[PDB]
Every structure is written in structure tokens, then in C-alpha cells.
Write a protein that binds this ligand. Structure first.
Ligand code: CA
Ligand code: CA
Ligand code: CA
Ligand code: CA
Ligand code: CA
Ligand code: CA
Ligand code: CA
Ligand code: CA
Ligand code: CA
Ligand code: CA
Ligand code: CA
Ligand code: CA
Ligand code: CA
Ligand code: CA
Ligand code: CA
Ligand code: CA
Ligand code: CA
Lengths: 184, 184, 184, 184, 184, 184, 184, 184, 184, 184, 184
């Protein structure tokens, strides 16, 4: 009945909820890393937290790419930083080289610095489907924080991020994110 | 046999049926909300109701988008308003911000004001597939009404709606809907 | 075992076979209804029948649409008329309104006048895939006739039809149909 | 409990019946092939068929030879053509060489193009028994047809034939044949 | 343990292999029939045969179409001729009418002259995906031959073919085929 | 078990087939010995062999005699030479004396040099039945060869022969023979 | 139990990791063969090896094609060379003919010189989706080497390769590859 | 058997060994952090490693303090950095304040950035026992590295360190360390 | 009931047989490699093969050395090349150095390129036993070929060879070889 | 109980006995075949036989070689001729080529014309052991004869022989033989 | 189930291999000791090691002697030095006296300083067999080393050696050695 104890435990805990949107970004050939969980700050509201831990019950990521000028590729890597000490990770920490085709960095994946949640490649064609999107929903895990406010120094172990990278600087991408979490 | 009892009960109940069509609508960047169950009004006909309750056995939504002038995105959110007190809900009650990429409103979803039945995004490309459609069929639930006629004030707990929102004002969408319901 | 005697029974019965083709038709905004089983007439040949009943073992419908002039939609509704009294059914008997987005007629579906076998929508784009097709194969049922020849008055309960309806008058569609049937 | 079911199925099926006679033919040193099942044509009578299949329950062949001028040999080969595509098969399809002593064609027998039902050799002597006959009765099989009328093009898989070949051109042979068949 | 006999048996039998390619053919509105297994001729090599039988363990067909001048359809029907007596079958033997939309010939399918292995339609659009392909792998059956060399008269019962038919004469199609077979 | 396995082994083996005719020979008072299996030579065709062994599944001998000038006797001895070293055996190897009434050679039979398959005597009368024939079908055994071509030196252990001997030189006899064999 | 033992063994072995990228290659009508595992050289780093064996736990191949000038096809064949003696295999070793439609080489596949891991065809259309990609992850096997450095002479049994071949010289393809391997 | 497995595995693995000494250091009131596992570098010797992981079977730390000028306290904190990304951690990451009496940093301990292996305080008195020492032996865990050589950037998750802090700058402390590890 | 199957399958398969003799060879200080199974070529005779596989049931090697001028050593290594791609292997592929005392090549033996069947050393003395010989019989395995004729290019995986090497150029060695094989 | 009955049967049967010696023969490079059982002739003595059969219970062969002029090899092949028709077999019937190194004749061994009882090679050296001998005892089999006296024509199925062949004409060999046989 | 784990463990470990040859040495009356395992040095190649331990799975020693001038004796003692501290053992450490007939040193054998693997004496006669050889294969044990390179100081506990001693200074001996070892 351990599955029953877990359930009733959860019925006593508020499932707080945080939403984020990030629209109108340029595709990046060298890549960028975007914060997802950083925006849950200390405070008393439904989308805030008490202390330096929350536990994500589920979270959802929506990504979108639109080709501009040339047909092009957008890659989105949704990941957990298991070992974050107050930074936004770099592209080269996640990828072997800063290229949209690159495989993961062998060292950081060997030691499990990161866990990859989803790796999505969208090809947007100006002679075909020039707009593409993907939404992904996943159960979550503990998130630890190193500080109270929405700055990079507050990220901690379990922080959630998304790396974007592609083969042009000209196309535009949008994202949004929701986390449902307890905070007991 | 409680399953055979349900079966036998439903065979004594008329399965009334209501149909609706809504076409030639422009895409909305701030969103709109369409009524679906509101059109079942008090009366004696096959697509009407006695009293202020019906029970939807099954219902079906057909949505369609056509890109005009620019390639563009159409989002359709089919939802149940569990707590309706005589209104058509606003876009911002359902979505955190009035943007086609937005996640759900954290507060109204935490409290289960709404239940999302299906959330559909169609990307219509003028260099590709410019017309897209989707039909979804689902078992239904109780619908309560707050009045006799087809006005917002008659919507009640269980009312069914569709939110439309997109990234352009220029393309056109169409929808249709059927509900099969008992009224005993 | 009955599943066995059923097997042995069928091995003593000739599986007669009827094929039909219907090419180069215009898309119809008000819709049309095409005959499928009507062409099995009284006679002694492999694609004919003795008496006024056959039993369809399996039947197969192939539909195809080609956009002309504008990107457009073709809908094909394969159906059985459970109650036919010597007619070709009208579009409005099947659909609530004569529009390619319409839901079914609530009255005729409530009373089970028709059974929908498959409902197929093909979106043909002159900036994308302008030619689309679908083949569907299904087990069949009894077909009764009201006369000997290939005229509407000969359709009877169980007659098989296809409704075609779309959003333009200028695209072209094709269909073909096969029925494999016993006639004992 | 099938055996008794086979019996019961058969009691519901008309056992149609077809008879043929073919008298006064000359012995052939190069052989000839005679039709037996071909004469069952599409029609409504007791010795006709609905559609392009019948199932022979039993069939019977009677052959007879009479020596004239010299003592001589008549051979009769009763056979099924499992693969007929609308022909009367040739002597060389069945026999390795066109001689009354020949063994079967190795290729057509290997691939089971033909099944030999009975192979009968009668030696008719003008100093002994100058007239000889043989009657053979066997259970039958499915017969498929490729058309409606009594022409070679209507023979199909399962067609029944008799090859006659001997060592003189002058003796006379007679045959007759009956098929009892269902036609459900 | 009798299932392991089959396996044990097959480890003692050489699995010979034959490959074929057939590139750059025009789409045909009246259709053509292409040989697939005919090219396995008598001889001592890995892609030849001893005698007039082989047993296909598996075989693979790859088809491809490219639109030229107009958007168009290519249909490919992979089939076994269960009753071949030394021909390449005609289009009308397989199809009711010589049209890319046609259903199968009712007579030849009734009598099981042919067994359809796969029926594939590719729609190639010059405003979309102008090149399409399909690869299909299936277990095989006995193949009998009527002669030694790669001519039509050598086809026999079990011979494997592909019918090609489409709605234009101008597009080009390619095919390739492999059979893995035992020859004991 | 062993019964099914044997059956299954044979389903994977080509049953090759060889046919032979030998017409119009004179009755021989000193006897002759005719080759039957010798004519299966090395090669790739249906009536040839790989290597120096085949296994006869079944074989059939047809013999015929016709009296000329005087009533007379024809004897046909169908036999296997279990020990053949590249010869056509002599009459005296098989028969004690070279006379149509003779019993077998005591020595060669004691040591099982030969196995008698069938011994047939036909008395043909010019005042009665002047023409007689007999067909015999038997399961077969291994046949080894000592060479590749249809010459006496290629006969080997298991070779099949027929001795003919009679009481006149003037009558004529005919024979034919078939062997069905595997060659794995 | 041997299952949990596989578990405990592997937790004591370092899972070394190697990554590779190969961008901006022209499509090849005669094909090329690319090295994948060759780049793991003798050394002490995370992406190197001790001795001449490693065991690939998992490996991942990402392929991508972009049509240039004409719509065109790119095929990628990921394979293991079970028998490599210090070479990069040739296109004719893997394919019956050097054509993007070709089936596999009958001889090298019969003898299991190669094991095909995945065979991918991407059709890239300049009127449609001009950019396409595919990522494939598979468990791996032992890899033996014939030398220490990243040259063809160091490939050995188990070496991993990708063959690229298409129908134009003008389009561009990219690939990347990761192997996770033990080196105990 | 299970516990035997672990023990059997280990007899097949070389237990490499690394020793370190660090003598004659001043007591630090603000503290210092010393590297312990960092000195195991890539190479082939008994005290080196292949790749970027080793597994410490056991490790031993010896610490010593000598009071000089004033009686004083030396604290030594042996710890594992579970999340190291290529640094030597600071005193303030481990201790709430940089004082020898401080409790641990609440945040880094909450999130398990560090695991404390042992925390030892030696009070050295110039009127009593002026020299004190402690040796501690513990089983070990996996160590991951971020580089090949003995620099801070090579430290990785599982790196082992010792923090020293006290209440004078004048006393002297010594330490030494051994790790016994597998490297398979 | 499974061991009986093996035995039963083999009784239906011809045990073909190939013999070879290779007399009067000089002893070689740098070694030579002799072909043994290469001489079985495609064809229809008892010592030939159909296709590119045979299965050796048993094979026998006889080797002999005679000292001339000086007492000397002859070594013979009977081996299977598991990975042959159409060559005669070199001495250095099999042996670490080209010397009659050499141990095997570490790399090719590690990866199982070769399987050593028998390694025989004969010391022939002009003051003692100047002639020595050895005969070895072993069960065999599958042999694959890469072509039809007796050239090195036709050797394939499973090819059988003998390496000869010694300490003089002047003595003479002889060999002979037989393989008994199935070829189904 | 096959063991007891068999023993008792033999106690009632005279075990007759025949001895032979054959001294002072030259080594033969083309080989010779010597008779062993032939010398048991019809008669009433202990070393003779009644009729044309005996059963060898046991037999013993002693062979010896003496080098003269040159060190040389003597081979002795003791064999049974299972199919003898009154000859002394030739060397080429037994050996592939007439050389002391030859393997057996593939054809005559395949068909089991001969059974090899023992194959012995003696290397006689004028600088070592110049005289060698070997004695071999085996259980025997049935021997059939084709005549009464000690001439080649009396040899029959089961006759026992010895083939001698070597690499010189000048050395001398001796043999002796005994057969113990029943003659009931 | 510990023979399964042992087996499974070893399938994950590279079996490295080292080969050695040592030709053309003089017989020694006072003896010599040759190194065998010392040549496995630290490095990354197939015949090298990581760290200071390997585990020999099997090893093989080949020894050979040739008499020169006088008939003479060669003795070879293959042994493991269980206690080596970085030397090459002396002859008197192994043998009681430095004479080829000596028994072992009582003190070093009592304390098990050495384990004798094989002790071989070859008597080479210039009036008989002047060349003799022996190959010995044995399972191995752990080998520890005391340094990185192929010098005496690197030998450690488990080092493998061969002592050679004889009764002449003028004959020549050869040896070779192979170790197969894991290095995990
Ligand atoms: Ca909290
Ligand atoms: Ca109500
Ligand atoms: Ca009629
Ligand atoms: Ca009817
Ligand atoms: Ca019928
Ligand atoms: Ca065959
Ligand atoms: Ca397009
Ligand atoms: Ca051939
Ligand atoms: Ca054969
Ligand atoms: Ca390794
Ligand atoms: Ca190294
Ligand atoms: Ca490591
Ligand atoms: Ca073969
Ligand atoms: Ca007597
Ligand atoms: Ca007797
Ligand atoms: Ca080691
Ligand atoms: Ca001597």
C-alpha cells in the first residue's frame, strides 16, 4: 500500500504552480542556455517557495521554431543540472562542441552532472513546414536552491534548464514552461 | 454486474443529441472563448433539455485552420468549466498570459476551476500544408445550467467551451461540435 | 467451437466479388451521395446475386482527392443505410447541415438509420501535398435489396454508400470499391 | 463435433448434377484432351451454376475402347488442372512425350499443375476381347471458372479433363461423365 | 521441441541470395508488370538454383517514385502468381480495369490465382514531397520454375512480380529486390 | 515425433523427376539388360543431379509386350544392383541360365548383389490377348553413381535396371520409367 | 541470477565515452564509408582505450541531409564489420551495386561479414522539407582493434561504420556519433 | 552467492594505491582546503588512473598538530565533494563562517553538495600535551575527474578534500593520505 | 527426440568428398601458407559445390617431412580462417615473428581471426629418424566462399589452411588433405 | 538377452582357422593389392570352407618393412571390399592417386565400396630404425565368395585385402594373416 | 552458480597477450635463468599492462635443443617466483648445486619461494635424434611487478622464469613464450 501512503501524503500538500514564457528569441549557432526553474523565488505566493527546496511533481516544456530568410534547424535540450553550485551552465558543459549536431560532453555525462530530459530537433523549411512546435510533459524531482532571488547564483542541485542551438542566427524561437511542485 | 446495471439503465434513457457549427472566424492573438454546451436550451426537442441538468455520454469537437497571407499557428483548447456561475470565461482565466504559447493559469488550474479536455496546436504553412484539422471524441460528464436560454447567464457547473488563440489575426478557423446526452 | 462450424460453413459458400470505379468527379460544397453496393444486380455472374440478399464478408473503399486552383478539403463518409426503402439518401439525412464541417444529423443517428463505417477528411494543398488518398478495409454485414437492377429503387436495408463533401467545387476526386460477399 | 456438422450443412445445399456423353471418337497416336467440367455453364437449371465456383461432391467417368482393323491400345488419363487460366491443356503438358507409353511431364507434375485422378490402359484385341470398358467414381473438389459459357476460356483452377492417347488412329472410343456438385 | 527441428534443419541448408535493381522507369497509366524472381536461373552460383524449385525464406522490395512535370501518383503491387504456367501476367489479370485506382480482378482473386503481398501508393508532389520511397520485408514461400533461363517461359507457380501503375507517363520510378532462399 | 520430422525434412527438399521411354524392342531369347536410373546425369536441370548420389522417393515402371508371328512370352525383371562398379550387368549375373524360365543366379542372390523389385511375365497370344502391359510403382532407395554422364561406367551401387527375356525373337516390347528423387 | 550479476559487474567498470562530429559533406552517388569507432585510440583519457578491445554498452548515430540545387535522396547505413582485418570497407562490399537503391551484397551478408544496425533513407525536397535528420540509439557489442592509432589499419572485428550514398553530388550531409563503452 | 559475486569480481581487479604527504603547514584562522584525491593523475603506474573514474575501496587520513608559542586548537574536516565541477572548494562553502568553531554551511549541507567523512578537533597545550595526532581509515566511493592532471580543474564529483582551520596562525600541522582503489 | 533429428537430416544429405595432394615442397624458414578447402570449386561433381557454402563433416590432414643435407625441423599449423575476405593469409598474420619457434600473433588470436586446429612439429634427423609423418582427423565446420573458382579471392570465412615453417630451406615436405562435406 | 544366446550359438560352431604368409616383397610406388581371405577355398579341412560364405570372428594382420639402399616409407592399408564381383581391386579404386601420400578415392568411399580396417605407415630409416613392424587384431564380418578356388574370380562381397604402397621400389616388406571363422 | 559468474566476469575483461622468442643460446653447464613475464611493461598496447598487476589466464612455453659436436643433455625448468623483490633469481636459488642433475634447493622449496611449473630434460644425440623440443601449456596466476620497465628491478611476486642448464657448453637451445592475461 506504499503507493497508497504516497497518494494520501500528497493530498495534504499544496501543489504550487509556476508559469513562464520566453518569446521571440533568435536561433543561436553557438547556443544559449535558458533558465526554467530559477524563476521560483522565495515568497508566500502560489508561484514562490518557502526555503531552498521544492519538489517538482510534474513539469511541461513547450518549444517552437519559425524559419526566417533560410530554411533552418532549431534544437532544444531540456535538462536537469544535478550538481549546480550557483550558475547557468554553458553550452560546452552540455555539448561536446558548440554545434547543433554535437553529441553530449563525454565527461559531464559520465559523471552525471546533467540528466537529459528531452532532446528535440525541429527542421523548419521555407519551402515546406516553416513553423514547428513540440510540447513535452514529465514527472519531476527535487530542486535545491542556493539563494532567495531570481539570479544565477540561486540555482542549485536539481535546477532545470533548456539549451537552444541551431544552424542559423536568423530564425526565431519561442518557449514556455510550467512546474507543478510541492513545498512542504 | 454493476456494469450490466449501468448498461441496462442507459437503454431506458433517450440519448438526446445536439449539433453546432461555427465557421469563417479569424485567428485571434489575444484569444477568444467559444460556447459549446450553452446551445442546449430548455424545451421538448431532441437537441433541448428538461430542467437544468443533462449528462453528456460522449461529445466531439472538430477544429480546422487555414493560413491566409502568412504562415501561422492556431491553438484550440477544449475545456470544461467545473465552477461556472453564469459567464463565458475569459482568456486570462484559462491562460497565464493572453499569448498562444502560454501555459495555463496557475491559480485556476490549482483549484480545478477548469478541466482541460484537449489542447491542440495546428501550424498552417503557406509554403506547405496550409489547411489542417483535428477531430476529437471523448466521454462526457454532468452539465448544470443556471438558466433556460442560450445566453452566458445560463452557463453553469460543467459547461463546455473552446478557447481559440493564435499568432496572427489573418488566417481563418472553423469548428463544429456534437454532444450526445441523457436528460432523465 | 461455433467459431469452427462458422469456418466450415463459409468453405462451402462461393465468395462472389464485385468491383467498381468512379473517377474524375468534382468536389461538392453541398455534397453528394454515391452508390457502392447498388451495382450488384440480379444475375448469374461472379459480381451479381441470386435473390434480394447478399452477405458482405469484407469490403474495401479507396478515396482520392486532388486540389485544383485552390488548396481545399475533401471529406468522404463511408456509411451503411440500415433502413433504406429504395432511395439514394440525401446529404442532409446524414449531416446536420450541408457543409463539410458539419456533425451528423442528430435525429437519424439517434434512431440508427445510418451506421458510419469511416469518416475521412483529406486536406490537399497546392503549396504542399496536393494529392492525397486513403484505402480502408472492413468486415461487412447483410445487404437487402428492393429490386433487381442498378437503380435507386433497388437499394434496401444494409445498402452501402459514400457521401462526398468539400469546401470547393473545382478539385477532383476518385473512388473505387470492392465487395466480397456470399450469396447462399 | 464437426463431422456431423459437415453432414448437416450438406442437407441444406442442392446437389446439382451434370451429365455428358462423347461417343465414336478415333484413337489418337498424338493424343487429345477432352473437357469434362467445362459444360457446366452459368444458368438457373439443375446442370448449370451460379457464379464462377462449384464444389464437386462426386464425379464419375466411363471410358470404352473398340479395336478396329488391328489390335490396339487405348489410354485414358482422368485429371484435374489445379492451375487452369482459361485453356484446354495440351497432351505435352501432361505427358513427357506424345506417346501412349509416356510417363508424366516431370515439371508440371513437380509443381502440381495437374493432379492425376485415374490412369487407365485398355488393350483391345481382334483375336480376343476387342471391346473393353472401365467406370471410375471418385469424391471431388472445388472447381473455379474464368467465364460464363462452354468455351475453353471459361476453364479455371480445378477444371476436370480426360486425355486420350493410343497406338492406332483407327479404333473407336466412347466416354461419358457425371458430376454431382453443390453451388452455394 | 519440434519447432527446433525446423531451425536445426535450416542450419544445414545454404541460404542463397539474389539481388536485382531496376532504375529509371517511366510511370505507366496502363500499367506494367515487372519480374522479380525470374532472374534466379539454373546454375552453381550463390544467386542461382539447382532444379526447378527454391524456397524463399525472406524477400525484400524497395520502390521509389519521383514526380516530373506534374504532381502524380505511383502505385506498386507486389504479388505472387500461385498458378503461373510460363508467362509474365498482364495488368488486367491483376486489376479489374487498367487504372491506378482499380480494385483487384474479381475472378483471378476469387480463384486465388494471385496472392497480394503488398499494395503501395505514393503521391509525389512538385509543390511538396516530390520523391517518396518504401521498403517492405516479408517471409517467403516455395517458388517453382518452368525452365532454366531468365525468360517468361521459365516463370512457374509461386513466381514473384511487381505491377506498377500511375496517373502520368512522365514521372520516374526505381525498384530493387532481394530474395534469401534455400535450394535443397 | 520421428514421423513428423521425416515429413518436415522432405518439405524442404526439391523432388526432382526423371522420365524415360524405350519403345519397339525385339523379344530376346538370350535376354538383355536395360538401364533405368543411368540417364540421370550431373547438371542443374529438374531431371539431373548434383554430385554422385540421389535418393529415389518413388519410381514407376511400365512394360508392354505385343506378340508377332507366334504367340510368345515376355519376361521383365525390375531390379536394383546394390554393388555396381560401373557396368550394365549381364543376363547371367541375374539368371542361373539365359532362359526366360530360369530361376535367379544362386551366387549373386546369396550375396545380395541384386535386389529383385518385381518379376513380371506376360503371355501374349495371337489367338487371344496379343497385347499385354503392366505398371508398377514402388518406393525407392539411395542411388550412387561412379561418374557424371549417361554411360555404363557411371552406374554405381543402387543403380536400377530391367532385364527382358522371352521365348521368341519376333515380338516387340515397350517400356517407360519415372523416378522421383531428392538431391540434397 | 546471472542477470543481477551483469548489473554488479558493470557498476565496477568505468563507462568511458567517445564523441565525434562530421559536418558539411557532399552527397555521393557512388557512396562513401565513414569510420565511427576508429577514433577511439590507445591512451589514458576518457575517450581512449587500453589494449585492443573495448565493449560498447550503447552508441548513438545522428544523420542529417540538406537538399541543394535539386531535390534529392540521402541514404545512411550504420553497420558493424564483424570481420575487419584493418581496412575501411568499400561500398561494393556492403551493397550489391554502388547505387542508393541497391540491396545488400548477397555474398558478404550470407557469410555475416557485416551486421546492418540501421538503414535510413531521407528524401529532401526543395519544394517541401529540404532538411531532414534521424537519431538512432542502440546497445553495442565487443570491438576489437588491429593497432593503436586512428588509421584504417587499426580497425578490427566489431568496428562500426556508416555508409552514405545518394542520388546527387550537390546536397550536404552531417553526422555525429557517440559510443559509451567499458574498457576492463 | 550474491555477496560472493562482489568478492569474486574484486579478486580480478588490481587494487591500485596512491600515497601523499603534506608536512609543516601553519595553523589557519580563516582556514584552508587541501586536495587529497587530486594527485591521482592519468597514466599507467600503480598510483595513477586510466580514464576519469576510479573507485576507492578504502582510504586513510593521518592528521597531526603541534602547538607553537600559544596553546591552540587545530580542526581537520575530511570530506567528499559530491558535486565538484573543477575547483578546490572554499572554506565558506563548507563552514557557515570562517571560524574554527563554526557549524556547517546550512545550504551546501542541505543539498548534499558535501558529505562529511570525519571532523576532528585537536587541542594542543604548551602546559600539557602539545603534540596530538589522529588516524582514520574508511571505506570509499566512486571518484570522477574533470581532467587528466593534478590541477584543480581536474577535480570532479566524488573528489576528496581536507579542510584545516584553528585559532592561531603559529602552530604547525602535518597530514598524510592513502587511497586504495580499483580502476577497471 | 532432438539428437535423432541431426542424424536423420544427415541421412538425406549427400556427403560429398574432396581430396588433394601437395608433395615435394621445400622447407621454408620464412614460412608459407597452403590452401586446403580452396580447391572445392562451384560445379556438379562429387568434389565440387553448389553456391558459396559447404559444411565440413570431417576432414583429415597428412603431413610428412624428410631431412636433406642437415637435420632439421618442420612445423605444420592446420588452421581455420574465421574472417577470410578473399586472401591466402600471410605467415605473420598467424605467427608473431616469421620463425618456426614463434608463438601466435597476439592480435589476430585475441580477436579470433584464426582458430588453430592442430600445431605439429617434426624433427627429422640424418643421424636418426630422417622421415616423419602425422595424420590428423577432426570434425569440421561451415565454410563460406567469396567466389566460384580455385583462386585466393574465393576463400571466405571458415576457409581451411596449413602454415608450414622450419629451420632449413633444403628438406622436403609432403601433405595431403580430404574433406567430407554436405552441400544442401 | 542378446549376449547369452549369441555366446551359446557360437559354442556349437567350429571356429575354423586359416593362416597365410607373404615374405620378401618389394616396396611399390604405384602400389599393389594383396589377397588375404581369397586363400580359404572350398574343401573339408580346417582352413577351408563349405559353400560360398564364412563369418570371420577375428582376424590378424602382421606387416613389416625393411629399408634397403635409401631410407623409405611403407604404407599398408587393410581393407574390406564390400561389393566385390570377382576381382582383385586396383590401387586406384582405393586411393585418389597412386601415391603413398594419397587420401582415399572420394567416389568409392562415398558409396561404401570399401571399408578401411587399418591404415598403417612405417618410416624405415638407414640412419635409425631400419626395420619396423605392426600387428593388428580386429573382429570380422561375413565373407561371400563367387567361386570355389583361390583365384581372383572367387573373391566376393566382404573379401579382405591389403594395399601396399611406398616411396621406393627397393626396400622389402613381409606380411602374414590369420582368420578365425565359422562356417555353419 | 559461481562458475557462471566467473565466466561472465571474464567476458567483460580484455584478454591481453604477450609473445616472446629467445633463439640460438648456448647450453650452460653452470646454468642460466631467463625472464619470461618481465617483458610485459607499463603501457597501452595489447602486450603491455596498466599498473603493477596482471592475471595470467594461460601461458605456453616452447623449448628446443640441438646437439653440436657432442651428444648432450638440455634441462629446462619453468618456474614461478612467488616472492620476487626485483631480481632475476640465481641458478643456486633453484637448484641445490649448479649441475644439470641436481635436485631442487631444499630451503627455497621448503619455504615455497618458487613453484615449479614443469621440469624438462631433452637428450640430444649426434648418433640419433639430435634435435628435440617440447611445448607446454598451463593455466596461470597473478603476477605482481615492482616497476614499469623491462628490467630485473621490475620483477615482483608471481614473476615467471625459465632456468636452463646442461652438460655441454656447445649445443644450442631456443625458447619462446606466450602469456594470455587479464589486466582489469
Ligand atoms: Ca521548501
Ligand atoms: Ca434534465
Ligand atoms: Ca439466373
Ligand atoms: Ca442471395
Ligand atoms: Ca457458385
Ligand atoms: Ca532446387
Ligand atoms: Ca511546399
Ligand atoms: Ca551446375
Ligand atoms: Ca546429390
Ligand atoms: Ca581494453
Ligand atoms: Ca597509458
Ligand atoms: Ca578508470
Ligand atoms: Ca552449398
Ligand atoms: Ca567336402
Ligand atoms: Ca559356409
Ligand atoms: Ca593491471
Ligand atoms: Ca642412428
Amino acid at each position: 500500500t506504499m503507493r497508497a501512503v504516497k497518494r494520501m501524503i500528497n493530498t495534504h500538500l499544496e501543489h504550487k504552480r509556476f508559469a513562464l514564457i520566453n518569446s521571440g528569441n533568435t536561433n543561436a549557432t553557438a547556443g544559449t542556455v535558458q533558465n526554467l526553474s530559477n524563476g521560483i523565488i522565495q515568497g508566500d505566493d502560489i508561484n514562490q517557495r518557502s526555503g531552498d527546496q521544492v519538489r517538482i511533481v510534474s513539469h511541461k516544456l513547450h518549444v517552437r521554431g519559425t524559419a526566417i530568410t533560410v530554411s533552418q534547424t532549431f534544437r532544444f535540450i531540456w535538462f536537469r543540472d544535478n550538481m549546480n553550485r550557483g550558475t547557468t551552465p554553458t553550452v560546452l558543459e552540455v555539448l561536446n562542441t558548440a554545434n547543433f549536431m554535437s553529441q553530449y560532453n563525454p565527461i559531464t555525462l559520465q559523471q552525471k552532472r546533467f540528466t537529459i530530459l528531452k532532446d528535440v530537433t525541429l527542421n523548419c523549411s521555407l519551402t515546406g513546414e516553416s513553423i514547428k512546435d513540440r510540447i513535452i510533459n514529465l514527472p519531476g524531482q527535487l530542486v535545491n536552491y542556493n539563494g532567495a532571488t531570481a539570479v544565477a547564483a540561486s540555482n542549485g542541485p536539481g535546477a532545470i534548464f533548456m539549451l537552444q542551438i541551431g544552424d542559423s542566427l536568423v530564425g526565431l524561437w519561442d518557449s514556455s514552461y510550467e512546474a507543478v511542485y510541492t513545498d512542504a
